[model samples]
Target: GIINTLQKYYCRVRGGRCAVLSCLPKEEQIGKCSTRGRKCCRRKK
Candidate 1:
């Protein structure tokens, strides 16, 4: 469950989402996710 853990980490730590670049509409990619493949994104706001 490391990826899940990492996802949570990003959700809280980075205050981000594990979806598109960063935003559902205006977010940007941060870096590699917990698993690597999808881009880790942070809130643009």
Candidate 2:
């Protein structure tokens, strides 16, 4: 439900690859995106 809505919104705002993920993640696969060197919304201690 959430993913479908997210995909729709993402397609509207940020289009291109907006296909839904039907299959489940494998043991070796990473479920979510890894935020390496990502921007911080707020400073951390």
Candidate 3:
């Protein structure tokens, strides 16, 4: 199976936030962050 190693763009301008795979609260990991082994998250519904 192919790994879903997604990558995020424009996190600086967008509402996306970076976390150490710790998307707490109403956040969800949409893709990988700029930092190594980190995740990109945004406001969840």
Candidate 4:
């Protein structure tokens, strides 16, 4: 649910697809574009 919400907000603001990516030290970032150019948000592993 939260990821979906973030994706919606990101799309509205970023104007592009968002994707969740793993980061160092147990961190994550949103706004990673999708292959189809859709929005997505990051989530915990």
Among these predictions, the greatest TM-score belongs to 3
Q: Rate the local accuracy (lDDT) of all candidates.
A: 0.55, 0.26, 0.66, 0.43
Q: Give lDDT tens digits, candidate 4, residues 1-45.
A: 354455435535744234444333333444435534443443455
Candidate 4 lDDT for residue 19:
40
Please list the residue runs of candidate 2 whose C-alpha ends up more than 4 Å from where it truly belongs after superposition.
Answer: 1-5, 17-45
Candidate 4 — which residues are off by over 4 angstroms? 1-4, 8-27, 36-45
Clash numbers, per candidate: 5, 0, 0, 5
Q: Top model by lDDT, which number? A: 3
- Expressed as tens digits, the lDDT of each residue in 1-45 for candidate 2 is 354444223323533221133322221211222233211121122
Write one digit per residue (lDDT tens) for candidate 3, span 1-45.
Answer: 996543545455464777875765778766667567677778876
Clash count, predicted structure 4 = 5
RMSD from true fold, candidate 1: 7.1
Candidates ranked by TM-score: 3, 1, 4, 2
Error of 2 at 25 (Å): 22
TM-score of each: 0.41, 0.19, 0.49, 0.20
Between candidates 2 and 4, which one is better according to lDDT? 4
**Least well predicted 10-residue stretch by lDDT in candidate 2:** 36-45
Residue 5, model 3: lDDT of 43
